Amino acid sequence: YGTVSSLNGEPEQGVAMEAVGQNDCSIYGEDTVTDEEGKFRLRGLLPGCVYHVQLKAEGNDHIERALPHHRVIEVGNNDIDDVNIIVFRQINQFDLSGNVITSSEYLPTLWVKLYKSENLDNPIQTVSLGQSLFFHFPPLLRDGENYVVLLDSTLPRSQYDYILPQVSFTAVGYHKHITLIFNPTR
Amino acid sequence: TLFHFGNCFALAYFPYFITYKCSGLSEYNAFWKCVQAGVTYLFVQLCKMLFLATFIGEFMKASVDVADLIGLNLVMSRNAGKGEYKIMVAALGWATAELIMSRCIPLWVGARGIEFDWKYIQMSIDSNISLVHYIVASAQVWMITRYDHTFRPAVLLLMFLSVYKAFVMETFVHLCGSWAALLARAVVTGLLALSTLALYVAVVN
């Protein structure tokens, strides 16, 4: 008998809600999908055992966390009230980033790449560094997808000597800060 | 360090003046002869530079030595008189040419400033020993000239082989300190000086 709201206060809808018991009461417990208001109507009020409201493993794919994972509530000679849990959705973007360590004069002559692993000859993104030592490749999706960050500069070997770095950041996490280092000589 | 430049110039130029005043300059007024010798030395230096541009280190040194010997022989043959006096008009002229060359202009641009490297005093020392080295070269020229006995051509060939001793010693030092190298050059040049005076007392007849 509480509410399941989001971080700001928006009432989440379609979130599975149940209460799993402990001790000998582990066999008792029901579930209830919350409504638009976030007012769940859990039933099965048996005293003598503490309850644990927490998010069902199945049927809750879109929703990532429940910040108060469990709420200890003492079941006395009455009902429970004011059980609020805040929840976060599952962000799917990757939000790539990463600085570049190089001299100032070499910066305008650089474009970082996003060569996909399966084909190192067909880049999918070519954000130019320009005058800023920070590239912010537009967000990607995260499911395996090994990538490359080959730093493809315009400076040829005819007047300078350099080696272009190559970084693989197989996308299973949530961020990355590739730090390509470009220090040409001669 | 202008006064350092003064001390180095006093070390270098003054012995030439001493030789000029102690060798009877008024006998020929060798100023014209010295100028002609310097012009010949400049021409020989230009020819050596052209040969080096056309064309390992030993060959360049040998060519430079041959050109210097030819110029000294021409200068000596330009005048007739006492053998010691043609010796003087050749050697002093060539030595003055060397001093006016790249052992006075660097002495001007360097030194006189704030830095002090012993290189300048070393250059002055080497310029002073170049006087006796060119004395030896002129002695070789005189042995070549003054008629053709008692294995004199063999001794002249030995002196010619011993010539380019400065380049030989420089190569040896490169293969082997700066002051140690200068001392070694001084001793070998002095040994050639004594060999040449021995040749002179042998040839006086």
Binding site: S6, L7, N8, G9, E10, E12, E64, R65, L67, P68, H69, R71, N84, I85, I86, F88, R89, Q90, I91, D95, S97, G98, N99, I101, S104, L107, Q131, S132, L133, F134, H136, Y174, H175, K176, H177, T179 | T1, F3, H4, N7, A10, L11, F14, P15, I18, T19, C22, S23, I114, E115, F116, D117, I121, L197, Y200, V201, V204
Partner: protein
Amino acid sequence: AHEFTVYRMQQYDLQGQPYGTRNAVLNTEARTMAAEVLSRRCVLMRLLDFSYEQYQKALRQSAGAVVIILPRAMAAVPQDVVRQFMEIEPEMLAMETAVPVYFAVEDEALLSIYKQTQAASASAEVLLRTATANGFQMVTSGVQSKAVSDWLIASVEGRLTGLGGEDLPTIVIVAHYDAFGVAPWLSLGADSNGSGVSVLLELARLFSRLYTYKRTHAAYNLLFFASGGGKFNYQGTKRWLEDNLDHTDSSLLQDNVAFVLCLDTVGRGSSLHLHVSKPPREGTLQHAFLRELETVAAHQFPEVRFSMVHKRINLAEDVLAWEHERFAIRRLPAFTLSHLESHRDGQRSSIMDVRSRVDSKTLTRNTRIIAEALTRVIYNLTEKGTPPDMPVFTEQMQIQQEQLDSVMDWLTNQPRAAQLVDKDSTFLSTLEHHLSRYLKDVKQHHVKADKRDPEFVFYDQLKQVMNAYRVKPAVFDLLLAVGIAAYLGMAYVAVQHFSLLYKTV
């Protein structure tokens, strides 16, 4: 003739009174520390034996210049000497020393010249000393420092709109990216507010991630301000606060301004202190945020001791202590967060603040604490349940340790002194881009000088190149003159000697 690069001491002016060295020309011998005259002579000391009594003796003796040979590594130097050089710095800087002070970097030839000068300075003996008097002469290049009259102190500002309404409270976060040490070109400033601008950048990233999505879009405007012109009395904040208050009538700095956070030297250390100019009034937003901060620092991370520091505003000091002072002057709620406990501590400035002095773990923990306190106060969580025995930033929003490390490395990569970061330098451009990828309405405020009673006039010629010319006194060369006179006499005799020898045969 060695050609090393010497970085000069500070030459900034504030409110009209000068500070630091006021000379950038020297042409004297290099007489290191000895009982000799030491007047109008460059004095060479090494940081390993750089005592303050010795330095004050050098300055009082009117030396030609003072050159300090910093160790090349600047990290292998013993920590006790580092602490002593921390305690020497604020007193050394706050003076009108008319003798140039240059800081150099160790070199093999530098070690050789220092050794020779040390041997010659301390020490038949008189003539031998004159003969072997290898005392070098050091001369610099360029002309005297000229007052740069058109230096624009930069400032990067970015907004974050709330959920709905035109009266939302506007929490403000500021951080002065610059850091001045005893040498502007050597003032990397890693543990200084350069470790606070990194936390500000990470807070920007995290709150941008939280605000982009509707369901976590809280109704609290966040005005981030990576201010320039920092330890120089916080001019960048002064001009920004003046232009957003009295010149215009719009902008969020007047509507419903909530607490104004300020971050500086928030890196190393196991203690966090929230400094306030005046105590928070009970019930207001500042008191709520302070309660959230104390609850977080007492329940989530017990390893940090937390305590308010209430320093009353003082209008007599040269600088306004913290950064929240300039905000509290204009009747604006503000407080500063710092690992320090006393503003008088010289742990700031600190050319010694190399990158290896800000521990990444401590920086991450401090960022966690600050970000969680802000999240709890902003999102009204405290009166919603959510016991403080479990965090918000566990997964999918974890404070990126790699990002913090890379940002810190980039900040320390180049000097960040306010006199060297141009209005269009790649440091400022990269900072603006980084803030622009996460914020909205990012721009660049500038303060020139007000051109009347100059609030600040930074000077130039801070990276002069100095030449180590070998030289010997004229007495040596007089000895050489006597020698060459003897040589000339020997040569004069030698002509007649050889003539007699040839005659003898």
